[PDB]
Motif scaffolding. Structure first.
Motif, short mmCIF file in Angstrom:
data_model
loop_
_atom_site.label_atom_id
_atom_site.label_comp_id
_atom_site.label_asym_id
_atom_site.label_seq_id
_atom_site.Cartn_x
_atom_site.Cartn_y
_atom_site.Cartn_z
N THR A 261 30.49 49.05 36.76
CA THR A 261 30.14 48.39 38.00
C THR A 261 31.26 47.34 38.20
N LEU A 262 31.42 46.85 39.43
CA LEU A 262 32.42 45.85 39.72
C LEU A 262 32.08 44.55 39.00
N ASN A 263 30.78 44.17 38.99
CA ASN A 263 30.37 42.95 38.31
C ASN A 263 30.60 42.98 36.81
N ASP A 264 30.27 44.10 36.13
CA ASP A 264 30.49 44.22 34.69
C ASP A 264 31.99 44.20 34.36
N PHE A 265 32.83 44.78 35.25
CA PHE A 265 34.29 44.76 35.07
C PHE A 265 34.78 43.30 35.07
N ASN A 266 34.35 42.52 36.07
CA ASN A 266 34.73 41.13 36.20
C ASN A 266 34.20 40.27 35.05
N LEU A 267 32.99 40.54 34.53
CA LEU A 267 32.46 39.77 33.41
C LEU A 267 33.37 39.94 32.17
N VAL A 268 33.84 41.17 31.93
CA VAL A 268 34.76 41.43 30.82
C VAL A 268 36.18 40.89 31.07
N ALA A 269 36.80 41.25 32.21
CA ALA A 269 38.18 40.89 32.50
C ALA A 269 38.42 39.40 32.57
N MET A 270 37.42 38.64 33.01
CA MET A 270 37.57 37.18 33.06
C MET A 270 37.63 36.57 31.63
#
Ligand SMILES: CNC(=O)CN1C[C@@H](C(=O)Nc2cncc3ccc(F)cc23)c2cc(Cl)ccc2C1=O
Ligand SMILES: CNC(=O)CN1C[C@@H](C(=O)Nc2cncc3ccc(F)cc23)c2cc(Cl)ccc2C1=O
Ligand SMILES: [Cl-]
Lengths: 305, 298
Positions: free
Chosen positions: A226-235
């Motif tokens: 999901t876009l949100n899970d991607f951002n939680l990891v990448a940040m």
């Protein structure tokens, strides 16, 4: 085939570089039509640099205090005005080499070519990106102030950056061609520091699509995100958040390679987790973030290998 | 501060790029004085037999939006020389020079006689260049600038199956054991340009990156055995002499820096970078390092 950090041909910009001298300070100016644009700090001494009152320093100057040299020819200054952090010197000769041009303000993540200059003479050209913290990681020595950043899409030169200073970490700060700084910087020798920098996520994704186009898929996996899970990891790796705008922008590269943006996001998460394992991607052992989706489409083939 | 892969300003070369068309083939040409230089494969092989059939009017040369009239043609090795009726008013001061592996140059990539980009690269020890070229880039040129003189050193001819590029000097002599024809050709096993990695280690020290320095020194003999083991080109006494100025500027003797390079080859970077790179960079010569850390202009 191949993938290089490629700059635009610099000829249209070389024909605009001039030397500007005011007192003991010498730097570079951009001569377009009958106006020479340069950093307003050319009117400062090194002492003035702590708390300069540019309006007070400028009122004390006359046209003949500014010496402008174009090649081996002295240009006559017939007027002067300040616009934000840029000084505009009206000269009595229009530049016959003036290309078709525009002044554009860019956003972080955008790339551009820099024509590094000293004494109004160009020494080199390189490609770079406006970092998320608004600094540029350039290669500039003393005397490079007034060197410009640009893009040349078609026959029009879009001027986007003018060099003003180097920060204590060795990174650079400057303005658009209307004299507005990129970032929370001031043209003062006061304690200033670049904010913590981050990786331009949309650019790393574009560069992963460029690797697929050139024939490399070792880093892909069978997962999506999901876009949100991607951002939680990448940040957690100091990567900029990926917005829906970025996903939309990656649409064409996704259609060309057959890899959904959120599937490419899943390869990125895994690359961040595992490293490269002795492998390279487009001749690099790091994840490259100074190629935009537009740069990848411009440089790469239309047919995926 | 900062260290970038920097190309020479391309303006003097942009004013020489033209489009050459012969039949269905379109590629780039270099217009200097009244001659246009381009790859002889624009006529495609028995090149002398194919050329004799051609007349001057079969070659269409376009400089911007102007058609140049071809008044003569001759072949020199793998380059075709088209005599035109107009001398290029933008011809810079120039020379044709042949470079050696390890030397770097700027490439002005072109399509349809129009320059699209400029990048810096090195002639690899296997004589290929790792360029960025698509179909239509043939005839794009490589160059250096010394003072106001453009030294033309490369003309693009082809891409090999691994994605690397092959071409000639401006007298039409290929760099490498290549031929201008679609046949089974492959780049040889490549090696790392050792003198260039050392120069880039000195550039890192100049820019404040000193974590890899150590108290040790080595000999040319000991280091060359290590270099041969890691597919690195041998370091000669000439290379050591060439690195003399950078050694005097930083206070690190060349064999002192070789001991750092030996340790980097046997142990890696350990999660660290040098000048923002996790690999040892070999496409900066000792002269490139001195020029970029001094601000020489053209
Ligand atoms: C590192 N800078 C300094 O020691 C002195 N300094 C001079 C000037 C400035 O940064 N010029 C330079 C620009 N780009 C690369 C430079 C590399 C080296 C260098 F010594 C100076 C460079 C400046 C301009 C403004 Cl608008 C604000 C502050 C300053 C300033 O602090
Ligand atoms: C990969 N190329 C091919 O399969 C066809 N090919 C055409 C031509 C050639 O290499 N041109 C190209 C140059 N640079 C980038 C190229 C990217 C892609 C591309 F298809 C062609 C490129 C060529 C010239 C000569 Cl002198 C000898 C052989 C050939 C040849 O084999
Ligand atoms: Cl932008």
């Amino acid at each position: 085939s191949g993938f290089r950090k490629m700059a635009f041909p610099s000829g249209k910009v070389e024909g605009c570089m001039v030397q500007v001298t005011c007192g003991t300070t010498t730097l570079n100016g951009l001569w377009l039509d009958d106006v020479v644009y340069c950093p307003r700090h050319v009117i400062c001494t090194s002492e003035d640099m702590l708390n300069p009152n540019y309006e007070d320093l400028l009122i004390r100057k006359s046209n003949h205090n500014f010496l402008v040299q174009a090649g081996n020819v002295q240009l006559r200054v017939i007027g002067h005005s300040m616009q934000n952090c840029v000084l505009k010197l009206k000269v009595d000769t229009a530049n016959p080499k003036t290309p078709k041009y525009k002044f554009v303000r860019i956003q972080p993540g955008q790339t551009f070519s820099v024509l590094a200059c000293y004494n109004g003479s160009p020494s080199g050209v390189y490609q770079c990106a406006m970092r998320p913290n608004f600094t540029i990681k350039g290669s500039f020595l003393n005397g490079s102030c007034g060197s410009v950043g640009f893009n040349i899409d078609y026959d029009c030169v879009s001027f986007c950056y003018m060099h003003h200073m180097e920060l204590p970490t060795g990174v650079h700060a400057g303005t658009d061609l209307e004299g507005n700084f990129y970032g929370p910087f001031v043209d003062r020798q006061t304690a200033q520091a670049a904010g913590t920098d981050t990786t331009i996520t949309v650019n790393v994704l574009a560069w992963l699509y460029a690797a697929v186009i050139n024939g490399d898929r070792w880093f892909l996996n069978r997962f999506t995100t999901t876009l949100n899970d991607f951002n939680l990891v990448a940040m957690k790796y100091n990567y900029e958040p990926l917005t829906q705008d970025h996903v939309d922008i990656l649409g064409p590269l996704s259609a060309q390679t057959g890899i959904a943006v959120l599937d490419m996001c899943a390869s990125l998460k895994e690359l961040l987790q595992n490293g490269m394992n002795g492998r390279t991607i487009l001749g690099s052992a790091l994840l490259e973030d100074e190629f935009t989706p537009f740069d990848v489409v411009r440089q790469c083939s239309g047919v995926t290998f």
